[PDB]
Each structure stands twice: as C-alpha cells, then as structure tokens.
Amino acid sequence: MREIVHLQAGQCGNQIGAKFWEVISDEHGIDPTGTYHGDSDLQLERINVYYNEATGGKYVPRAVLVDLEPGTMDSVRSGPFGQIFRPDNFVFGQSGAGNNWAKGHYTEGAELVDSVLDVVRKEAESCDCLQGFQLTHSLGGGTGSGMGTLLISKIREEYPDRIMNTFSVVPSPKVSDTVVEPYNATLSVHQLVENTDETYCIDNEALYDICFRTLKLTTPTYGDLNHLVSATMSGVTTCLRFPGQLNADLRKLAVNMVPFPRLHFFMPGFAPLTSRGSQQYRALTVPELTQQMFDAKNMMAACDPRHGRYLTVAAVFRGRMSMKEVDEQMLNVQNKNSSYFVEWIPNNVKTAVCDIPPRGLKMSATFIGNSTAIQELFKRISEQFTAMFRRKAFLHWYTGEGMDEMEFTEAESNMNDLVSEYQQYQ
Amino acid sequence: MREIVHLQAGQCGNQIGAKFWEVISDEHGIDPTGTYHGDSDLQLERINVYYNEATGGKYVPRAVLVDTMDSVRSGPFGQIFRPDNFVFSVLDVVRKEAESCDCLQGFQLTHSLGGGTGSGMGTLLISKIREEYPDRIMNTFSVVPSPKNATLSVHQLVENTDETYCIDNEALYDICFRTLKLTTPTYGDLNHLVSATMSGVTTCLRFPGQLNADLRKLAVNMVPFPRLHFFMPGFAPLTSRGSQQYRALTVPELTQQMFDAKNMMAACDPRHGRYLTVAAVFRGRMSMKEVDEQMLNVQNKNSSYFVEWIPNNVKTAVCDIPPRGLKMSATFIGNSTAIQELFKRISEQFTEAESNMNDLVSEYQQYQDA
Amino acid sequence: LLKPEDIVLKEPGSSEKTLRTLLRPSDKVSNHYKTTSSEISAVVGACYPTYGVPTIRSDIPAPLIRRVSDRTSYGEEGNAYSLLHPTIFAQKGVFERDFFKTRSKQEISEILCNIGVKLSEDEFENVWNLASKKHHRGEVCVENIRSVLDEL
Amino acid sequence: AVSPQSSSTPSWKIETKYSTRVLTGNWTEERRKFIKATEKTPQT
Amino acid sequence: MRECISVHVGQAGVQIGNACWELYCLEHGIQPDGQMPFNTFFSETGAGKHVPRAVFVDLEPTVIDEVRTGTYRQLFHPEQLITGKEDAANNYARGHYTIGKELIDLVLDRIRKLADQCTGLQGFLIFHSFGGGTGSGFTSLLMERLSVDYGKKSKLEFSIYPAPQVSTAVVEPYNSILTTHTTLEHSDCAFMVDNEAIYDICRRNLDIERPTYTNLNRLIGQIVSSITASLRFDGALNVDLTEFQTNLVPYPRIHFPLATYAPVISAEKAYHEQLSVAEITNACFEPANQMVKCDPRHGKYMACCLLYRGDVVPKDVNAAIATIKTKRTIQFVDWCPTGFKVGINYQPPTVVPGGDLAKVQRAVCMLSNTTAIAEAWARLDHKFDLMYAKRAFVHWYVGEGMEEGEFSEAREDMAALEKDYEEVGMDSV
C-alpha cells in the first residue's frame, strides 16, 4: 500500500544489498525458495511493501540489480538467497566498468535508459501504490557513481514528488583501496545536493571500528561488516511495515530533520550493540540503548560528533516498550548537553515506536542524525583534491572519454559552498 | 606475562641447551617433528613463553645457535629448529625475535667462563643485547674452570647479567660417584642434570603454581647489593637403583636432601659458608605447613650458619605441577659466602680487571663481617 | 573405515573440523598433572546428623514430678501471652500433655456421651479412624479427636 | 576527550596471532561462540 | 539493600575469593552458573542468571586465567576480570608507579559502573595483604582514588598481617610501612589475620596434621560470612555497616582489630560434648583459639563485638556475659565500662560440603579490638631498621621511581603509631 523501491547498483550495492534482502527475509519469515513459513500472521499482511506476489504463494522481491560488469551477478546468485531474486532484473553489461566514473556516466549514459529506466517504469507503475526511491551507490567506484548516480537524476526527472534516500558509501583515507578517490567521489557529491533529499553517509573505517571496540571479533570479514548496515536499512521502515504505538514514515522523518533545502546530509547509527562474550550480563533496557546511541564510538560515519553541534536528531524504536522513560532520557540529553545542540531551534529529537522486536532481540533503536560535522567528511576529500590538481597527474584518463576540465572546477566550486553553509550556522 | 630468548653460545653451552630444549619439550608434550600432544589442557596455556608456532600443529623455539651444529641437528631434537638463524647478523636475529615478541622479560644464554668462545663472545653478545634491551633479566648459565681467561671475561658480565651459576664438573663428578652410585659419568648425564636444574625454576613462568614468583621478583628477593649475584644450584630427590625402596618421600625428607652438603652443585664448604638468600622451589601436590614448618625448623637448627642480621634467611616457592615420573621434587638455590674460594684460586692463577676481582673478594669479606 | 568422531579445531566453538590428535603411550600426563588452586574447591549448589543440644530440649522426655533444682527447659512453660490471656483449660489446670496423652477407647467413649455430644457408633469408629489418620504416629488424643470432629 | 579502553580491543597495530587455546591477548571473546535463540514473532 | 563492592586484588586475596563466592553461592540456591532454581552481593539479570558484585583485578595472569577456565567461569562479568601484562615482583614502585598506573582509569569506571547500578550502597570489601607489590602497595592505589570520589563510606579490608615468626617475602617491611602511610587516612576497618595461628589451630582442635592453603581460605571465608550475615538475614539484634565506625575505633588511628570463630571442631569431638551459649563464648577468650598469632593475657580488651549466629536465646547470652566479665584473668580498660556488643541472627552456621567441619547448631564470631597487638608493632619496625641502615635492597625500589625521601618519612609515621598505644593506655586520674 506504500511500496518501497530499492535500487541496488555496483559491486558494492549487489553485496551490501545482498545482506539487506536477508533481514527482510527472516523478519517476514521468507524461505530461500520463495514461500513463507511461519505461524504469526502479523507479518504477511504487510508483505506487499517488499514482496510482490505470484502463483503458488511465491514471493519475489521488488528489486533492481544492475552493473556494467557481469562480475557480481555471478556472486549474488551464488549466495544462499540467490533463487529469491527476480530473473529478468539482473541487467547485464558484457564489458567492464573499470574504476572510472567517466565510462558509466556519459559513455554509458545513453545505455542506462534501456537498462534500468525501462525495468523501473515496467515495475514501479505496476504497483497499486508507491512511496519512494532508495538507491545505494559506492561513491568511489565505477558503476555506483557511474550508472547509478545518473539514474538518481533520471527517475527524479520523471517523478519530482517522491523521496530519495541514499545510503551512500563515502570512502576514508586510512583504509583505502584506490588512489584516485578524489576523482570519482568528489565528482558525485555535487550531483547529490540537487537530487537527493535524505542523504546518509557510510564509512569503512568506522565500521571496522565498531567490530573492534564493541563486538570484539578480531578478524572481521565484509559479511559481518555488512549486517551493521543491513540492520540499519531494515530498521528505519519499522512503522511503514508493522503496527505499533506511534508510526512514522519517510515524509515524517524528513519534515523534522531537514530545516533547509541544502542542510540535508545525515549520518546513521544503531543502538543495541554488545560483545560476543558478555551477552547476558548486560540488561537491554531503555537507558542503556540511549547511552549507546549518542556517543562517538557507535556512530557509523567516521566523524567525531563533539566538534559540531547537531541541528536536528532523529530516532526510531521497536519492541514492547513503555513510553515514559523513552521520552524522558531524551529530555535529559537535550538539557544536560546544551553545548552540543544549537540554540534557536526549540526541539531537536524525534521518536517513533513499533510493536515487534527484530529477530532474536527484545528492543532496537536505529539512529539518524543531521549534524554540522559532516563537513569533516567533506573537507578531507577536498583537501586532497587541489593538492593533486596542481600537478594534474591523473587527468589523462578523463579528457579521453567525454568530459572537460571545466566541469571539474565546478564540482569543487560548489563543494565548498556546501561547507560554507554548515560553517556559518555552527 | 614473561618472555624468554634462548641463545646457545660456545660448545658446552650448545650441548647443554640442546638438552634444555629436549627437557622442556618432553615436559610440554611435543613430538620432535613438532606436533602437539594435548593429553591435558595445562600444556599449551603458556607455551607462548618459550615458543612461537607454525601452520599445521608445528612449533619452533625462540632460540639462536651461535658459535657442532650439524651434530646437534643430527642429534635427538634437531628438527624443531628454524634453519634461517643458525648464525656462524646476531643483532638482526635478536631484534627479529625480540620485535615479534610482545612484552619481554628475560634471556637464557648458555656459555662457559673458561674458553675462547663461551667467554669473549659471551661478554660481547651480552653487551650487544644490554645495549638493545636495558629492562630485561639475562639468565646466563655458565661453567667456570675448576679451582684445582675468566678474569678477562667477567668484569663486564658482573655489570650486565647478575644471573650466572658458577660451580662445576668436580662437584658434578663427586655427586655422581657418591649420592647416585653412578659408575660411568658420561658428559650427557651432566648435561641432563644441569638441564633439569634449568627447568626446575621455569615453572612459575609456565604453570599456575601456588606461590607464584617470576624472574624479576626473584632478582629483587635474592640480590641485596648490585654486585653480589653468583648463585648456587642443586636438585634434591636423587637416589640410586637400590635405595628408593629404603627411603621415603615427604617434605621433611626432601628438606634433608635439599640442604644435604653432598647434594649441592658445589665443591665448596657450607661449614665455611653463610647463605644470604635461599630459595627452595618445590614441584608437586604438597601440604604447606610441612613446607613452612620445615623451612624454619631447618633454619632453627642453624642460627650461626644462616646469616646473622637477617630475620628470614630463607624463601620457599611451590608449584602444582611436579616433574615427569617423580611425585614431588625440590630444587635448592643459594647465595652464600662459600663461593669466594673459587675467586681466590682463579685470581692467584687486565690488571684493573684483577683489581676489580680483588674488590669483589673484599666486598664479600666486608659484608660477611659484623 | 574411519572413526565416527572428528573433533573441532579449537577451544573456540564451531570451528572447522580436524582429526583427533593421538596421545602416544607413556605420554599421558592428564591423570598426574592436576591443578591445586580451584580443583580442591568444588561446591555445587545442586545429609549429615546434627550435633549439640537444642535450646528447647524437646528431644528428651519431660519428667513427671520436677526437682527443685531443675532449671533445664522442657517447653511446658508457654509464652507470656499464653500466661496473661490463658485458655480456660489452662485457667483451671488441664494442659497440652493431657491433650496429647494416649487415652483409651473406653475413655473416649465416656468422654463422648458426657461432654454433650451424641454420636453414632459408626460415626465414633470413623472419628477414631480419621484421628489415627491425622496423627503421624497414630493414637487417640483430645486435640486430634476435636480437630477431626470439627473438620468432618 | 578520550574514553578508556581495555587491553587488546582495536588491533590497528599489527600483532602476532595464536590459536585461542593458548591464553593470549583477546582469547575469551573468540573462545565463546556467539549465541542467539528465538521462539516466534510476539504479539502487539 | 545494604550492598558492598567486593574486589579481590593481589594473589593472596583471590584464592580466598574463590572460597568467598563458594560460600555465598552455596548459602542460597544460586548455582555456580548463577541460575537460581542475595541482594547484598548479587545483581540479577532477567534471563534467569545472577551476577555477583566482584571485580578480580591483579597483574598476575594465571590466577585470573585459572578462574575463566575454572568451574566458576559462568558467574562473573568477563570484563570485571581485569589483567595487565607483567607482575609487580613484590616491588612497591612496580605495583603502584610503573605498571599499576596503567590500569587506574579502567577501574575508576568499574567501581562507578557497579555503584550506579546499586541503590543503597554502604561500602567496600577489598581483600589484600601487607607484603605485596601488587598486594599491599597496589591496594593503596585503589583506596586513595575512592575517598576522593566516594569519600564517607564504610570500607572493610581483610589483610593478611605479616606474622611474627614466619614469612616468605624478603623485602616485605619496606612497603608494609608504606601501606599504613595512607591507609591511616582513608581506611575505617582494616581487619587482619596471621596465618601462623591457623596453622596451629588445625593442629590442636581440628585433628589435622598437614594442612594445605585450601583449608585456611574456608576459615577466612566464614569470618567474611559472619560479618555479612546481618545484611542478607534479618535477626533479633542487627549490626549494620555504618555502626562499625562508632562501635570500634575510639581515636581515629586505632582501627585495627582481631577476629576469631570459636567452635572450630571435627565430627568426632563435637559428637561427644555439647555446645551451649555459655561455653562457645567461653571458648572465645581462651588463648588456644584466636586466629591471629598473639597472646591475649598481656592485653586488655577494649571493645569486643560478639557476633552470634544460629540457635541462641538472648537471656542465655547475658547470663554468659556476666560470668566472663567477673573473671580475674582477662583484663579490660577502665574508661570503657560498656565493653561488649552482641549480634544475634536467625541464620545458622553454614557448612561447605566435602569439608572437615561438623554440623554445629551454634557458632560465634568475636571481633575483638584489643591492646596486645602494639607489641607486634615493636617487631615490624625493628625489622625495618636493620635493612634500611645499610641501604640493603633499596637498589630496586629506586629502580622504578621511588627515592630515599619517603622511607624515613614512613618510619616516623609508624613510630608515631606505636606512641598512640601509650597516650591512651596510660590511665587518667
């Protein structure tokens, strides 16, 4: 009735989202061969949010899985859940994406209209209702900031009214993979401002940090690193999908958290995190989740939230919960920490409730935060741009496929003007 | 958490350290090809002290052989070693293992004080390690010549190590003829007995005992003033093929043979000796009123001979894990006045080094006096 | 041709499988190298007779006629509340040993028709049976007979 | 302001690694296998 | 809800802490894993578990590691089991200055995390000794960092006093006299035990030859359970934990009292002869049953605190107290005509299974502040004088930061402590 369309693109987005369509599988109790097995009939009445129907009770996801390689669709079908995904919506590219945002965005710009746009309008019009559009691209690669981020300006050209919600993977300098990350990620955050209202930020050092300080596992793979985000993405729609006490949705999370049309870069979190050895020794109640919620070590974008005042702060909740103390510790943390919130805005906290706890838990509280220290993410990726631009060193890959020098200067000439707004209202 | 780097320097040290590694490997249950045997869970808990492991159940020591080596590898347990550090460079290998180590405490160097390899290269290499790790303890087991070269050697060593063990083959021979009735002293038997005396004091570093005292604590307890550090070992429950069924085994019985004069490692005279510090390290499952009562009872039998102007002239240690075979065992170690006779003979046998030896003899004299 | 047991690879749980390592002969040190710190201390929360005297001395029988010198307790002197507000039995001198004493069948039969209660013979047999079932050892007592007659 | 840490949480410095039988740094949390158990979806 | 924090620090306090949490768990229905098929010592989590309030901090790795592999591993929080890297080597400047300074930020949060969980907290139960670099120096780190934070709160430490005639340490009296340098400022009840008397109590009453250390941890275990019964079990005459700082210490540096526990007996002697109330308190005062090496006949008792337990009647207590205070042998002090103090509870003496004790109906715990321990301070600075004259063993304490400027400063402070058994012992007119 309020169906959600998820656009998974890239070598990232087909291995990040490959964990995202697993917690949607068990919280609705979906078998990996299509049919539902369970007893409680609360979770098949709102099955249509994520699962279309066919004959024989079979539920396939509304899914888009695109890449310019054939590389990663030989891996998402190679997982445990590969039979669940739809057969036609793997949209192939026989060639390679090849690290550059030049190949996907302008050379493969005319290719994506036959590729992704003709599958979306086939699908998203066919639903009995719609809510919004949610895409997960890697900023530092070739398909995500190639095919995917042009589509963020393509469907938004068709339907202006809906809501864009990008769980975006911005890289960090400490854990690095490619040396030209000022050349694929800086060239996409200029496009995100006009065309994506709800813009999250995911890092790769803070995610290992959470599996070091908190879960204490010593050799974390990507699969353990991708459930701390796959719990987040499933845990934000906990009121569009289940009953409860105080339901919220993706307009009710954007009115509270976006005061200005360009002050809209959020950052995430996830409350109930405790180690592998002390499971039962911690009492998961209200005042301990909200003590995990606010500190610097828990928050998934690799920034220190103390240098910058939160303009606005959101939340969500689940589980059989008593409202009073939930609404009470968030009376304290605005009041005791008046230094780390702005003045001139009376309220800064939003809360929303559900009824069902997640699988194997009792409570949960996903965190979404608009702070004015996301400019720490966007000063370091412009600190290294013009310190590399002056030798022009890796430019000779970009004048040979169809973009000029003159659009390179404008992408950072508005990057500071983003930061010139966060700094003024600090 | 204590750590150990073991270096065999000079020939006699090489063949005694070989028996050292054989003794610790049989006490820890490793097949000489390197595979682990896990009959009990206490064997592998602190193998990190002396070893680092390999892929597939193989283990390999933290030992460097520097100076014979083909004979050692041809011997019983040669296959455990690392063939890349058989140096004959030493600085590079000692920082390699000491940089792969986490928190360092002490070093086991096997040498002598009577020859051209165990003495000069020993003093050089102790200088070359004390210049690199000035916060560790160098347990440098040593062999000195019989009173019936060292003056060149010792006068940097007494500054550096303070954990040497110097009485020798004449005492070893007379132990073998009298208290064992052992007809043919082979060199390997003396290597065996010295090696077990090594392994006796390395159980507070590897096993959870009862009164747990590591090497730095042993240093603080034993050494009063920074130049009186040459110590006297001995291993108690030794007897023959016959006398076992005639003797009994108790803590008062092993006290007798850890303070037996014919048992200690010394061709010396406790009747002319005065122990500043004694430690008796016990291994086994033994009641401790027996230990403490027998401790101060055998101190009560001799008021003159244990040192005056010190109230507690003794110290006991005990671990919960005995040797192989024997239900309980003891190892006695002392710091007496019964040791300057060797210095007097080796000095009556450059010139500033001789003067420093006369200084150390006068140091014993002026501290034995009232 | 293989054994049915193949172990995990570490003290960590759910490790990948590995074979059981063989402990060679005369190299089993498990039976000899047991620990001594916590191994002697095994007190599981999942037995012996009791020594001394009780402060009430109910285990010894009470003497019939007391000596003057007797200061040893026997429990017959009740609470001060039971001396300050006594039952009428205590008010005129019949007490709990006269309740709990073993009377006779003819004594209870004389008690029945003279205490103001008219009882059938079968009802009297049932009352004696219920009193003997109520008493653990089994006899006729005034408290047991009155309690069984009140309950049934 | 920094917040306190125990022994061997981050491992951003490079350490040698042992099998967890040997009582070494960060032994216990990898000795214990992570445990979870559920019965069904509750009601509202 | 009169809770206390029960740290076990050093080696000489943790095997008792093995035996301490045996005796609390067997007393109630709590299993070793903490599942009950208590609120003073135990925090309860709603899954079905109970968690004790005890942090086991020591520098020595193996004695904590033998618990995490032990049979009580499913009891504690496994972040309370705190270990550093290298031992303190019985060196004060290693257990308080160079390795002990690394672990004090962690354990300031850990006493704060437990106390934020507790409701009606009434103090601390630290368990240390008087000889350790990590047992006597390091407990004076965990003491001065709490009175700057918690301040006025009742601290009860059970500290193995260095015996007159036996010992095992060597450089012990250099920092024992430094332990008392600050625990006079910030300790309010520092109970003490010599083990030498318990070596001979077993030899006379208990039919024991060859006793281990595992037997002495149980008898020290009972005294802790005797003083902590009035928090978990309501009685006729309660004694709570702020009352111990007005009963006992008369002048603010006389807070070092003894302890014993009278009917230690085996199963063949207790069957033969009875145990009234008027003879287990007679067995308290006899010189063959105090657990600390001392002869009380040369000492005048200042303030006993008889803790009874089990099946006792309060007229039987006061019948016995006037028989004893008329005795011509045992002497008192004239300006304390009050003297004694009772405590009667309805919970019996417990027994450990597999032990040597018998099932006695009554058992007492007298906790006598006495005079006679002053002459045991005559020997603890006589021992200090001789080593310090020739500067013997100083070459290592100066190794890790300490100097000579404090060793004489502590000796006069332990000289001034011996004087304060003479301004108060010489009676007014």
Ligand SMILES: Nc1nc2c(ncn2[C@@H]2O[C@H](COP(=O)(O)OP(=O)(O)OP(=O)(O)O)[C@@H](O)[C@H]2O)c(=O)[nH]1
């Ligand atoms: N009650 C009891 N006392 C013990 C035990 N083990 C040792 N001790 C006592 O501890 C004394 C010496 O220990 P400490 O002075 O406390 O030294 P420490 O605290 O252990 O410091 P470290 O040895 O470095 O760990 C000895 O004289 C023993 O009397 C035990 O298991 N139980």
Ligand SMILES: Nc1nc2c(ncn2[C@@H]2O[C@H](COP(=O)(O)OP(=O)(O)O)[C@@H](O)[C@H]2O)c(=O)[nH]1
């Ligand atoms: N932490 C984490 N990082 C990922 C994951 N997948 C991709 N990345 C990051 O994404 C970058 C690689 O981009 P890539 O996927 O090859 O770009 P694409 O070819 O356009 O899809 C690298 O910096 C990786 O660190 C993941 O599952 N976890």
Ligand SMILES: Nc1nc2c(ncn2[C@@H]2O[C@H](COP(=O)(O)OP(=O)(O)O)[C@@H](O)[C@H]2O)c(=O)[nH]1
């Ligand atoms: N255990 C053992 N000791 C030996 C053997 N050969 C010599 N020694 C000892 O080595 C000592 C002399 O060697 P040393 O002076 O060090 O000559 P170097 O080895 O060339 O430096 C003698 O006192 C012997 O006790 C042997 O085969 N086995």
Ligand SMILES: [Mg+2]
């Ligand atoms: Mg210790």
